[PDB]
Each structure stands twice: as C-alpha cells, then as structure tokens.
C-alpha cells in the first residue's frame, strides 16, 4: 500500500476560506480510500499507479482541485484552478489517465507544484516526506 | 438548485461502524458540491438531472455506496453493496448515466430503498421530505 | 496513559438527530485531549483519575451529556439527560469530583449504563474493551 | 442571542499543525453551544455575558486556548499560550469570571488580539464583523 497524508494550511483571509466539497479515488491499483484524523486527510491506496482528488470551494465561490498519487513508485501532484461548477472532481480525476489531457502532469512525478488562479489565489502542494510508502504533503492556500 | 440533506443513523454495533471514504458529484446540471454541518451531509446541485455518491467503509472492511439525486424533478436513490476496493465511487456514480448498468435504478425515482449486503448488513435510504427543492433523507445502517 | 475511544450509534430517527456541542477534559491526572479519527472520538488522558464529557444536542432541542473516564484503574461512565441550556459540560464535568453530587456515579466504575430521558430518548454506553489502558465503548442513542 | 463564527487559518507549516482538543461553554447567559459547518466553528450563546474556549494542540505538542465571547454587548477575545497539559479549557474558561485572574482581559472587549508563544507560534484573533449579534472572526496561527 501507499498512503499520502495532507495538512491544509490557509494563509490569507483576503482570499476567502476553503472547504472540501468532493473527494474521489481512481480505480487503478485496487483503488483506495480517504480518511480524516486530527484535522488531516489521508489517501490510502492499494499500490502504486493510482491517485485521488480533493475539490475545494471557498466561501467566495472559487473552485479548485488538488490531485495526489503515486506513479511508478514516485509521488506526484497537481492543482487545477478556475473550475466551472460542472467540472467536478469526478470529471477531473480521470483526465490524468487513459491518455487524457492531464496525464503529462502525473508523469512528471512532482514533489512540489505552485499555481495562482486567475482570480489571484496562490496554491501550493509541497511534499515533506518525498520517498517511501507513507508520504506526507502540505497543501497551502494563499 | 436542488439540495439533498442526509442524516446517517447506525443501528447495530455488531455490523461495525461506517465512515465516509469518498464523495463524488456527477457533472450534469452544472454539477454540485457536498458540505457538512451539525453532523449532516448536504449535496447541493445546480438543477434537476444530476446526483452524487457517498462511499462508506466500515471498521470491519465492508465497502458500500449510497447514491442520491434528482431525475426529472423527482428524487432518487440507490445503495450498492459488496464492493471490491477498485469499485470506487468514481467508478459507480457514472454507471447511472450514459445508458450504464444502473440507469434503470435512477429512473425509478425512489423515495425509499432497502438492501442487505451479502455479509449481512442492512442499508436503507428513506426520504423524509420527498417533494420540492430542499429534500431530506435518512440513511440507516443495520 | 489511558485512552477511551467512542463510536456513536444513532438508531432511531424518531428521536431526532444529535451532534456534539461541547467537549471538556477534567484537570486531574495531567489532563487529556479529545481527538477525532474515522468518525470516532478518543479521549486520551495522562493517567488514571480523570475524565471528559461530550455534550450533544438533537435537532429537536434535547441536551444530554456523556461522561467517560478512569477511576482507580477501572473505566467509568455516566449519561445525564434532561439538561437545561445553562447546564453546560463545563458545569457537569466537575460535578464528579470534589465531593460533588455525581461523584458516587464515577465511583461505581460502570462498564455499561442505560438511561431513558424525559422526552423518551434511550441512551446506552457500553464498553466493548472493558479492561486495560486502551478502552473502547459504544454510545447508542435509541 | 449572540453568535461568533470562527475561521481558522494556519499559515506556517514550520509551527506544526494544530487541531482542536477541547471546546467549553461558560454557563452565564443561559449557556450556548458549539457547532461546525463548512470547516468553520460557531459558538451560539443565549445572550450577552458568556463565552466559550477552544483548546488546540499542535502535532509538535504545543497547547493553546482561544476564548471568544460577548461582554456588555461587545465582543471579546483572548489567546493563552504556553499551557501545561493539566491546564485544560475546563480550567481556563472559568478564569475569566468570578474575579478570576483573566477577568481583566474579558473586560477589555478586544476586537483583535496578537500574541506570540514561547515556542515562537504567532496567534491572532481578528474580528471581521465587530458589532451586532452575528459576529465573525478569523483565528490565525502563524
Ligand atoms: C507501478 C505503477 O505505478 N504503474 C502505473 C499504472 O498503474 C497500474 O495500472 C494498472 C491498470 O493499467 C493496474 O491498475 C495496476 O494495479 C496499477 O499499478 C498506471 O497508473 C499507468 C498509467 O499510465 O502508469 C503506471 O504504469
Ligand atoms: C430535467 C432532468 O432532470 N433531466 C435529466 C437530465 O439532466 C440534464 O442532463 C443534461 C445533459 O444531458 C444537462 O446536464 C442538464 O443540465 C441536466 O438537467 C439527465 O440526467 C438525463 C439522464 O438520462 O435524465 C433527465 O433527462
Ligand atoms: C489512581 C486514581 O484513579 N486516583 C483517583 C484520583 O486521581 C488522582 O487525582 C489527583 C488529584 O487529587 C491527581 O490528579 C492524580 O494524578 C490522579 O491520578 C481522583 O480522581 C480521585 C477522585 O476522588 O479518585 C481516585 O483516587
Ligand atoms: C450584559 C452582560 O454582558 N452582562 C455581563 C454578565 O452576564 C450576565 O451574567 C449573569 C450572571 O451573573 C447572567 O448569566 C446573565 O444572563 C448574563 O447576561 C457577566 O458576564 C459579568 C461578568 O463580570 O459581566 C457582565 O456584567
């Protein structure tokens, strides 16, 4: 099994306050499950080669997704911003597979990624444990 | 908009204790979002014709999904039990659409449904507010 | 240290639906802390001789407390029903100590307790692991 | 009645990550209740003249309390840092009343408060809606 534990940091009240509105798990590698403990979020997966997505909404209406997973035994991440209401995590998560338009991002196996949304919100995923089967990352909103 | 608010009742400790491991929203009708308040769960959707799925896991390892949505202005529900780990909610939710194998169940527009899993766990969805745009249901595990 | 992990089972929608409104920890035995994981609640305490209280409110307005702790190396519990709004858990938890009016209930060291409230709600605390430092109990509202 | 709704912003992973370990409500003004919705926390109180406390623990072991309430129709707040394990919120909340050692801090009726702890964690409470019965504040750990 692989697990990825996420801690969510929100830095700037001027950007609003984000909460989870959806959590998906892709079906490769015997799937996996999201759980919550002590304010953290863990994605537990059956092996290397799958992922899951958290979609967040802010109290100012902004919609963004955070994807984390393991690709060929190395962690990966992505953040997609500027989402329309119909672009749910259920739409987004499969786009990383089957030659979909985000596959290249999974293939990068990034240990960190940073994006600013068109409305001006910074998002970062930064893995703090970057190797092994019990991975850890901070997800930072600003 | 349509909303469906769920209250989860668990009746029989001998069946174990269930917690949410995944939540999806289908992309029709401008999608929608899951939220939590006072121990309840609300699916808020952009109109009639979409749905979302909660997947639960028990502390005894059982995996089941609860689907709720609105079809032609009437509520519907379904429960799928006996799931394998790879049969995530991301796999299940689309099976209600595009002529998938569960579409017929959505089309029934049920206000209640009951199933017992092969391992012996009863599940019921019972709508307590069955009309209008602010729907309410109890989800009962036993 | 001692821990008590609680699983809350709500059985009967006719009683309404309860959520937590307060959680206290008494200061003996170097105090302790509440945490949440996978839908469960754990009170971790620095030794034998302290306790904590969860107060619940139903969506019908009912207020009740559940107390759990360890007294002379044995678990104890209590459920107080029919509470007025001014009788917060901060009022109730100290009543088990300093010769207060509920000390005798702590001294019973009960592994199970059953009480039905003035409005008809049945409450049960039943320890499923009843000995040792890693205690477990089901809290059932029926 | 008065309510105070809190949004918790954790800014700086270098301080570790905090989660709630206790929530108390003082018994004046007919008491009150904590609730959670969309990642936020609301204390609802029966009138002016009471308060509640959230205690937080970081994954580095740091213990701090945040107190919010209404005193003579104006909001107040406090943050106490450097707490020992025996100094639970049940100990701290009453210290603002009955001529206790923190009463003067309640009497200040602060709309903002900033303090840095012995281990270097910055804490700010800043009310964003500072008048009326539906108060709002950001709690920032930095
Ligand atoms: C070892 C690894 O990460 N492999 C990745 C693939 O994962 C495998 O996918 C298959 C289905 O094709 C099956 O579910 C296996 O259990 C799973 O490990 C897959 O994610 C591909 C996608 O391009 O990348 C790797 O090869
Ligand atoms: C009114 C209604 O419930 N219609 C259902 C359909 O929903 C519509 O679906 C389209 C896409 O085809 C679009 O997303 C609309 O916004 C949405 O209302 C759809 O769910 C079908 C599935 O067979 O059933 C109804 O017709
Ligand atoms: C061993 C045990 O459970 N003792 C109980 C007492 O707990 C002790 O209390 C003192 C303070 O007086 C101190 O906090 C110790 O750490 C703690 O173990 C206490 O709960 C009394 C209450 O009557 O019962 C036992 O003696
Ligand atoms: C109006 C107001 O905020 N009054 C504060 C007091 O609150 C009152 O307290 C009494 C009990 O003495 C009772 O519970 C009332 O309902 C409540 O409004 C109290 O907090 C004092 C503390 O010094 O300050 C104000 O007077």
XYZ file of C-alpha atoms and ligand atoms in Angstrom:
672
model
C 0.000 0.000 0.000
C 0.864 3.664 -0.395
C -0.571 6.468 1.710
C -0.432 10.232 1.272
C -1.279 12.379 4.295
C -2.203 16.024 3.683
C -2.222 19.011 6.009
C -4.123 22.051 4.763
C -2.667 25.497 5.529
C -4.649 28.624 4.651
C -2.582 31.795 4.799
C -4.544 34.801 3.671
C -8.110 35.568 4.774
C -8.432 38.046 1.908
C -8.682 35.064 -0.432
C -11.600 33.576 1.479
C -11.733 30.268 3.309
C -11.724 26.895 1.522
C -13.512 23.675 2.479
C -13.719 20.274 0.855
C -16.703 19.669 -1.465
C -15.724 16.375 -3.133
C -13.148 13.583 -2.778
C -12.504 10.964 -5.488
C -10.308 7.903 -5.816
C -9.200 6.476 -9.143
C -9.770 2.774 -9.708
C -6.267 1.558 -10.666
C -4.061 -0.286 -8.140
C -7.102 -1.664 -6.296
C -8.441 1.810 -5.567
C -8.136 3.394 -2.151
C -9.938 5.439 0.474
C -9.876 8.892 2.020
C -9.925 9.238 5.806
C -9.665 12.065 8.330
C -7.788 12.190 11.625
C -6.709 15.103 13.835
C -7.607 17.596 11.128
C -5.520 15.869 8.439
C -6.550 13.907 5.354
C -5.075 10.598 4.252
C -5.456 8.883 0.901
C -4.673 5.165 1.298
C -4.140 3.309 -1.989
C -3.752 -0.363 -2.875
C -0.409 0.117 -4.630
C 1.497 2.397 -6.997
C -0.357 3.722 -10.046
C -3.481 5.453 -8.737
C -4.498 8.748 -7.164
C -7.290 10.796 -5.670
C -8.601 14.325 -5.915
C -9.906 16.784 -3.335
C -12.105 19.552 -4.692
C -12.300 22.680 -2.550
C -14.718 25.582 -2.636
C -14.048 28.902 -0.955
C -16.677 30.989 0.790
C -16.072 33.427 -2.076
C -17.161 30.768 -4.600
C -13.758 29.719 -6.013
C -13.450 26.028 -7.116
C -10.125 24.217 -7.299
C -8.854 20.637 -7.252
C -5.778 19.079 -5.666
C -4.625 15.729 -7.108
C -2.105 13.474 -5.366
C -0.983 9.948 -6.218
C 1.913 7.587 -6.913
C 3.199 6.934 -10.418
C 5.837 4.247 -10.954
C 6.681 4.284 -7.246
C 7.141 8.064 -7.022
C 4.759 10.675 -5.705
C 3.000 13.143 -7.957
C 0.698 16.133 -7.577
C -1.282 18.717 -9.491
C -3.617 21.639 -8.793
C -6.297 22.830 -11.230
C -7.881 26.238 -10.712
C -10.605 28.337 -12.335
C -13.035 25.427 -12.422
C -16.606 25.716 -13.625
C -19.317 24.139 -11.434
C -19.748 21.237 -13.861
C -16.011 20.409 -13.734
C -16.328 18.199 -10.700
C -13.529 16.083 -9.257
C -15.335 13.131 -10.857
C -14.567 14.807 -14.232
C -11.017 15.841 -13.286
C -9.536 12.680 -11.707
C -9.853 10.502 -14.858
C -8.206 13.191 -17.014
C -4.838 12.045 -15.599
C -5.265 8.591 -17.201
C -6.166 6.850 -20.458
C -4.135 9.397 -22.433
C -6.248 12.228 -21.021
C -5.157 15.839 -21.142
C -3.512 15.934 -17.678
C -1.552 12.673 -17.959
C 1.671 14.549 -18.666
C 1.416 16.224 -15.269
C 1.146 12.915 -13.412
C 4.129 11.638 -15.412
C 6.300 14.480 -14.062
C 6.203 12.881 -10.581
C 6.474 16.273 -8.922
C 7.346 16.684 -5.253
C 6.068 20.274 -5.357
C 3.865 22.436 -7.552
C 2.635 26.049 -7.375
C -0.164 27.799 -9.257
C -2.026 31.116 -8.913
C -5.651 31.138 -10.039
C -6.911 33.776 -12.449
C -8.726 35.438 -9.564
C -5.419 35.686 -7.671
C -5.291 32.791 -5.175
C -1.965 31.008 -4.717
C -1.992 27.233 -4.206
C 0.987 25.038 -3.428
C 1.445 21.341 -2.817
C 4.771 20.555 -1.143
C 5.708 17.012 -0.139
C 7.562 16.945 3.189
C 8.147 13.170 3.051
C 9.019 12.502 -0.587
C 10.083 8.836 -0.603
C 8.735 5.522 0.654
C 5.196 4.291 1.130
C 3.952 6.736 3.776
C 4.127 10.078 2.028
C 3.291 13.477 3.535
C 2.480 16.829 1.951
C 1.380 20.298 2.913
C -1.339 21.934 0.823
C -1.057 25.695 1.161
C -3.693 28.236 0.106
C -2.816 31.927 -0.242
C -30.954 24.467 -7.359
C -31.810 21.221 -5.612
C -30.342 20.085 -2.310
C -30.472 16.729 -0.548
C -29.584 16.656 3.149
C -28.654 13.296 4.687
C -28.599 12.139 8.291
C -26.702 8.918 8.953
C -28.137 6.509 11.544
C -26.154 3.424 12.558
C -28.209 0.894 14.491
C -26.249 -2.232 15.230
C -22.668 -2.256 16.534
C -22.369 -5.919 15.559
C -22.156 -4.775 11.942
C -19.222 -2.479 12.650
C -19.080 1.284 12.297
C -19.121 3.065 8.920
C -17.333 6.258 7.877
C -17.156 8.152 4.616
C -14.201 7.333 2.325
C -15.210 9.119 -0.897
C -17.791 11.635 -2.149
C -18.475 12.273 -5.856
C -20.685 14.625 -7.827
C -21.835 13.933 -11.367
C -21.284 16.671 -13.926
C -24.801 17.148 -15.363
C -26.985 20.103 -14.290
C -23.929 22.270 -13.577
C -22.569 19.806 -11.033
C -22.831 20.423 -7.315
C -20.993 20.206 -4.015
C -21.026 18.225 -0.791
C -20.932 20.072 2.530
C -21.154 19.159 6.211
C -22.994 20.919 9.026
C -24.038 19.761 12.504
C -23.162 16.173 11.662
C -25.285 16.092 8.491
C -24.296 15.972 4.826
C -25.795 18.090 2.068
C -25.457 17.617 -1.671
C -26.249 20.915 -3.429
C -26.825 20.599 -7.184
C -27.236 23.134 -9.981
C -30.596 21.760 -11.123
C -32.521 18.550 -11.772
C -30.696 15.730 -13.565
C -27.552 15.027 -11.543
C -26.506 13.187 -8.399
C -23.691 12.328 -6.042
C -22.370 9.270 -4.271
C -21.028 8.687 -0.768
C -18.835 5.628 -0.355
C -18.605 4.251 3.175
C -16.178 1.796 4.712
C -16.818 0.003 7.978
C -14.162 -0.747 10.567
C -14.791 -4.375 9.579
C -13.739 -3.603 5.984
C -17.161 -3.521 4.264
C -17.495 -1.092 1.276
C -20.827 0.313 0.142
C -22.111 3.301 -1.822
C -25.173 5.492 -1.355
C -26.354 7.452 -4.421
C -28.862 10.305 -4.224
C -30.006 12.742 -6.902
C -32.918 14.310 -8.773
C -34.245 12.879 -12.023
C -36.898 14.806 -13.950
C -37.700 16.868 -10.857
C -38.145 13.873 -8.536
C -35.739 12.450 -6.004
C -33.997 9.135 -6.494
C -31.680 6.872 -4.521
C -29.713 3.652 -4.668
C -27.361 1.623 -2.471
C -24.704 -0.744 -3.844
C -23.103 -3.272 -1.513
C -20.390 -5.931 -1.702
C -17.970 -3.584 -3.440
C -14.413 -4.512 -4.312
C -11.683 -1.985 -3.421
C -11.289 -0.956 -7.065
C -15.027 -0.188 -7.385
C -14.683 3.347 -6.127
C -17.473 5.917 -6.096
C -15.696 7.449 -9.102
C -16.496 4.165 -10.937
C -20.032 3.856 -9.533
C -21.506 7.362 -9.993
C -21.231 7.385 -13.827
C -22.893 3.955 -14.074
C -26.249 5.710 -13.514
C -25.852 7.660 -16.788
C -24.993 7.259 -20.469
C -27.038 4.050 -20.643
C -24.899 2.499 -17.905
C -25.979 -0.549 -15.958
C -27.585 1.330 -13.025
C -29.559 3.873 -15.072
C -32.784 1.935 -14.563
C -32.485 2.465 -10.817
C -32.205 6.245 -11.149
C -35.215 6.183 -13.487
C -37.360 4.603 -10.747
C -37.231 7.885 -8.774
C -37.471 6.018 -5.489
C -38.301 7.749 -2.217
C -37.011 4.720 -0.294
C -34.826 1.690 -0.914
C -33.581 -1.200 1.254
C -30.797 -3.716 0.655
C -28.920 -6.269 2.786
C -25.308 -6.934 1.829
C -24.066 -10.476 1.310
C -22.213 -10.229 4.609
C -25.498 -9.356 6.349
C -25.608 -5.557 6.782
C -28.934 -3.816 6.193
C -28.915 -0.409 4.487
C -31.892 1.854 3.927
C -32.356 5.254 2.354
C -35.666 6.858 3.331
C -36.604 10.354 2.174
C -38.421 12.290 4.907
C -39.021 15.333 2.673
C -39.936 13.839 -0.699
C -41.013 16.862 -2.766
C -39.662 20.304 -3.610
C -36.122 21.576 -3.950
C -34.840 21.043 -0.401
C -35.023 17.297 0.040
C -34.159 15.336 3.190
C -33.354 11.671 3.762
C -32.231 9.344 6.499
C -29.530 6.805 5.663
C -29.795 3.889 8.065
C -27.163 1.186 8.596
C -28.030 -2.056 10.398
C -1.780 6.966 29.946
C -5.343 5.791 29.325
C -7.471 6.261 26.241
C -11.176 5.779 25.661
C -12.403 5.516 22.077
C -16.104 6.049 21.407
C -18.268 5.079 18.429
C -21.633 6.870 18.345
C -24.586 4.848 17.059
C -27.840 6.763 16.478
C -30.566 4.177 15.973
C -33.912 5.880 15.838
C -34.767 8.857 13.603
C -37.902 9.386 15.702
C -35.683 10.881 18.431
C -34.192 13.396 16.067
C -30.511 13.586 15.264
C -27.727 14.530 17.685
C -24.463 16.378 17.192
C -21.699 17.373 19.597
C -21.885 20.860 21.070
C -19.125 20.750 23.721
C -16.214 18.572 24.856
C -14.458 19.052 28.213
C -11.496 17.413 29.957
C -11.048 17.415 33.716
C -7.679 18.562 35.034
C -6.618 15.611 37.226
C -4.051 13.036 36.026
C -2.252 15.689 33.959
C -5.405 16.367 31.904
C -6.008 14.922 28.469
C -7.290 15.686 24.995
C -10.119 14.767 22.645
C -9.373 13.789 19.059
C -11.351 12.524 16.085
C -10.471 9.881 13.500
C -12.640 7.962 11.012
C -15.841 9.193 12.616
C -14.834 8.125 16.137
C -13.820 10.091 19.235
C -10.885 9.379 21.511
C -10.215 10.875 24.930
C -6.529 10.467 25.817
C -5.689 11.067 29.498
C -2.397 11.366 31.351
C -3.197 8.595 33.865
C -5.993 7.080 35.927
C -8.224 9.506 37.818
C -9.672 11.927 35.283
C -12.421 12.077 32.663
C -14.060 14.096 29.928
C -17.593 14.941 28.842
C -19.272 15.202 25.467
C -22.432 17.261 25.330
C -24.845 16.505 22.493
C -27.802 18.457 21.182
C -30.517 16.963 18.997
C -32.194 18.788 16.145
C -35.302 18.618 18.376
C -33.510 20.626 21.096
C -32.667 17.815 23.547
C -29.442 18.317 25.588
C -27.559 15.397 27.157
C -24.035 14.660 28.356
C -21.915 11.534 28.168
C -19.053 11.270 30.692
C -16.244 8.712 30.396
C -13.087 8.311 32.447
C -10.933 6.060 34.572
C -11.301 5.820 38.346
C -8.824 3.738 40.338
C -7.718 1.954 37.188
C -11.232 0.963 36.103
C -13.397 2.615 33.448
C -16.461 4.589 34.373
C -19.288 6.277 32.528
C -22.451 8.297 33.040
C -25.187 9.852 30.926
C -27.074 12.879 32.174
C -30.311 13.743 30.398
C -32.958 16.456 30.633
C -30.320 19.217 30.760
C -31.184 22.891 30.699
C -29.235 25.186 28.355
C -27.278 26.667 31.295
C -26.071 23.197 32.347
C -23.094 23.076 30.015
C -20.500 20.308 30.066
C -18.215 22.810 31.796
C -20.784 22.747 34.671
C -21.291 18.977 34.599
C -17.723 17.572 34.388
C -16.577 18.997 37.768
C -19.686 17.595 39.494
C -17.999 14.155 39.508
C -15.187 15.447 41.751
C -14.510 17.415 44.928
C -17.403 15.672 46.693
C -19.816 16.939 44.032
C -23.254 15.448 43.507
C -22.244 12.958 40.804
C -19.094 11.588 42.457
C -20.965 8.418 43.509
C -21.666 7.647 39.822
C -17.969 7.819 38.932
C -17.225 5.607 41.948
C -19.484 2.852 40.542
C -16.883 2.224 37.774
C -19.591 1.110 35.373
C -18.748 -0.774 32.200
C -22.320 -0.183 30.914
C -25.085 2.290 31.710
C -28.619 2.678 30.354
C -30.992 5.599 30.859
C -34.092 6.909 29.079
C -34.779 10.628 29.060
C -37.870 12.661 29.832
C -38.535 13.047 26.109
C -38.192 9.302 25.500
C -34.653 9.012 24.109
C -32.838 5.867 25.177
C -29.113 6.185 25.857
C -26.604 3.405 26.419
C -22.863 3.475 26.998
C -21.394 0.021 26.691
C -17.682 -0.649 26.901
C -16.550 -3.276 24.367
C -12.983 -3.319 25.695
C -13.512 -3.070 29.442
C -10.027 -3.560 30.913
C -6.526 -2.223 30.313
C -5.295 1.160 29.087
C -6.868 1.182 25.620
C -10.567 1.215 26.347
C -13.379 1.149 23.796
C -17.082 1.891 24.095
C -20.195 2.241 22.009
C -22.515 5.149 22.745
C -26.013 4.310 21.482
C -28.950 6.729 21.126
C -32.200 4.876 20.548
C -28.815 35.579 21.284
C -25.263 36.187 20.068
C -23.168 34.054 17.762
C -19.471 34.112 16.969
C -18.286 32.306 13.847
C -14.591 31.475 13.552
C -12.463 30.592 10.522
C -9.094 29.053 11.424
C -6.162 29.989 9.189
C -2.908 28.067 9.752
C -0.197 29.910 7.847
C 3.154 28.415 8.658
C 3.994 24.694 8.479
C 7.154 25.429 10.476
C 4.970 25.739 13.598
C 3.462 22.335 13.078
C -0.227 21.738 12.563
C -2.981 22.331 15.126
C -6.243 20.538 15.797
C -8.977 21.081 18.374
C -8.763 19.029 21.555
C -11.493 20.623 23.713
C -14.399 23.072 23.456
C -16.116 24.573 26.520
C -19.064 26.920 27.070
C -19.469 29.038 30.181
C -22.819 28.845 31.954
C -23.865 32.521 32.114
C -26.455 33.981 29.701
C -28.268 30.631 29.508
C -25.135 28.902 28.157
C -24.576 28.159 24.498
C -23.331 25.566 22.046
C -20.531 24.991 19.555
C -21.321 23.781 16.049
C -19.381 23.144 12.858
C -20.298 23.874 9.243
C -18.164 24.050 6.082
C -14.941 23.925 8.065
C -15.912 26.795 10.383
C -16.884 26.920 14.061
C -19.796 28.801 15.573
C -20.423 29.493 19.248
C -24.100 30.343 19.792
C -24.897 31.925 23.180
C -28.167 32.733 24.916
C -27.348 36.436 25.423
C -24.534 38.839 26.242
C -22.275 37.893 29.145
C -20.847 34.460 28.399
C -18.127 32.850 26.289
C -16.511 29.635 25.149
C -12.988 28.313 24.688
C -11.345 26.190 22.028
C -8.180 24.400 23.040
C -5.802 23.419 20.243
C -2.853 21.057 20.227
C -0.168 21.051 17.550
C 1.484 17.931 16.203
C 4.616 19.317 17.915
C 2.862 19.197 21.314
C 2.036 22.903 21.765
C -1.164 23.649 23.769
C -3.040 26.953 23.441
C -6.553 28.249 24.056
C -8.685 30.733 22.163
C -11.520 32.383 24.131
C -14.340 34.339 22.477
C -17.475 35.838 23.981
C -19.614 38.901 24.492
C -19.204 41.225 27.470
C -21.666 44.076 27.971
C -22.814 43.779 24.375
C -19.315 43.974 22.882
C -17.174 41.106 21.595
C -14.093 39.986 23.437
C -11.281 37.542 22.832
C -8.106 36.151 24.358
C -5.388 33.665 23.457
C -3.477 31.861 26.173
C -0.257 30.135 25.156
C 2.402 28.018 26.850
C -0.225 25.817 28.539
C 0.651 22.744 30.549
C -1.316 19.534 29.927
C -3.235 19.974 33.213
C -4.442 23.437 32.140
C -7.446 22.234 30.178
C -10.049 24.559 28.690
C -12.306 23.474 31.554
C -9.704 25.137 33.866
C -9.212 28.209 31.677
C -12.787 29.264 30.751
C -13.889 29.995 34.358
C -10.767 32.114 34.959
C -12.465 34.971 33.051
C -15.247 35.177 35.664
C -15.882 35.344 39.405
C -12.976 37.768 39.848
C -10.588 35.213 38.337
C -7.161 36.137 37.025
C -8.210 36.675 33.401
C -11.346 38.749 34.029
C -9.474 41.954 33.091
C -8.818 40.511 29.603
C -12.523 39.881 29.006
C -13.241 43.410 30.260
C -11.008 44.886 27.521
C -13.642 43.854 24.909
C -10.965 43.413 22.268
C -11.850 43.184 18.594
C -8.290 41.959 17.825
C -5.508 40.355 19.845
C -1.988 39.257 18.904
C 0.401 37.121 20.941
C 3.485 35.026 20.173
C 4.184 31.940 22.246
C 7.291 30.684 23.995
C 7.916 28.265 21.129
C 7.553 31.017 18.520
C 3.998 30.486 17.246
C 2.184 33.692 16.377
C -1.532 33.825 17.159
C -4.045 36.447 16.085
C -7.778 36.729 16.645
C -9.262 39.414 14.462
C -12.974 40.099 14.300
C -14.143 40.846 10.739
C -17.696 41.642 11.852
C -17.124 43.545 15.081
C -20.594 44.791 16.059
C -24.097 43.360 16.357
C -25.330 39.879 17.263
C -23.795 37.902 14.394
C -20.089 38.272 14.972
C -17.305 36.879 12.796
C -13.597 36.421 13.419
C -10.506 34.946 11.859
C -8.168 32.951 14.079
C -4.688 32.919 12.524
C -1.746 30.711 13.560
C 1.491 31.905 12.002
C 3.587 0.633 -10.984
C 2.767 1.819 -11.491
O 2.708 2.864 -10.842
N 2.149 1.644 -12.662
C 1.289 2.684 -13.268
C -0.051 2.088 -13.696
O -0.686 1.547 -12.537
C -1.182 0.233 -12.758
O -2.328 0.394 -13.566
C -2.900 -0.875 -13.883
C -4.035 -0.649 -14.875
O -3.490 -0.364 -16.157
C -3.376 -1.591 -12.611
O -4.456 -0.868 -12.029
C -2.242 -1.685 -11.601
O -2.711 -2.223 -10.367
C -1.586 -0.324 -11.404
O -0.440 -0.488 -10.596
C -0.925 3.157 -14.366
O -1.257 4.180 -13.420
C -0.137 3.804 -15.506
C -0.967 4.929 -16.139
O -0.359 5.382 -17.362
O 1.107 4.364 -15.037
C 1.976 3.401 -14.439
O 2.378 2.446 -15.433
C -34.661 17.768 -16.037
C -33.843 16.499 -15.797
O -33.773 16.001 -14.672
N -33.239 15.981 -16.869
C -32.381 14.778 -16.793
C -31.048 15.025 -17.498
O -30.403 16.123 -16.852
C -29.914 17.082 -17.781
O -28.776 16.490 -18.370
C -28.213 17.357 -19.354
C -27.088 16.608 -20.058
O -27.646 15.652 -20.950
C -27.725 18.664 -18.711
O -26.635 18.391 -17.835
C -28.848 19.315 -17.917
O -28.367 20.453 -17.206
C -29.497 18.304 -16.981
O -30.634 18.898 -16.392
C -30.179 13.762 -17.459
O -29.832 13.448 -16.104
C -30.977 12.587 -18.027
C -30.150 11.298 -17.925
O -30.771 10.237 -18.673
O -32.214 12.393 -17.310
C -33.079 13.528 -17.349
O -33.495 13.759 -18.704
C -5.487 6.329 40.713
C -6.776 7.125 40.595
O -7.587 6.904 39.707
N -6.953 8.030 41.527
C -8.149 8.882 41.551
C -7.756 10.346 41.740
O -6.949 10.766 40.629
C -5.747 11.434 41.034
O -6.127 12.745 41.387
C -5.041 13.536 41.848
C -5.573 14.871 42.348
O -6.190 14.711 43.613
C -4.026 13.703 40.707
O -4.574 14.477 39.641
C -3.615 12.337 40.172
O -2.795 12.444 39.023
C -4.841 11.497 39.819
O -4.424 10.195 39.464
C -9.021 11.219 41.803
O -9.732 11.170 40.545
C -9.943 10.702 42.905
C -11.265 11.459 42.932
O -11.961 11.154 44.151
O -10.277 9.314 42.678
C -9.114 8.442 42.654
O -8.449 8.467 43.930
C -24.990 42.158 29.777
C -23.700 41.430 30.114
O -22.899 41.109 29.247
N -23.508 41.206 31.392
C -22.309 40.512 31.878
C -22.696 39.411 32.864
O -23.514 38.440 32.192
C -24.708 38.121 32.916
O -24.320 37.235 33.942
C -25.398 36.845 34.781
C -24.856 36.022 35.941
O -24.225 36.865 36.889
C -26.425 36.068 33.943
O -25.887 34.826 33.493
C -26.847 36.897 32.737
O -27.679 36.163 31.857
C -25.628 37.388 31.958
O -26.053 38.265 30.936
C -21.427 38.720 33.394
O -20.730 38.049 32.319
C -20.495 39.765 34.002
C -19.170 39.150 34.437
O -18.461 40.087 35.264
O -20.168 40.783 33.029
C -21.333 41.494 32.531
O -21.984 42.194 33.606
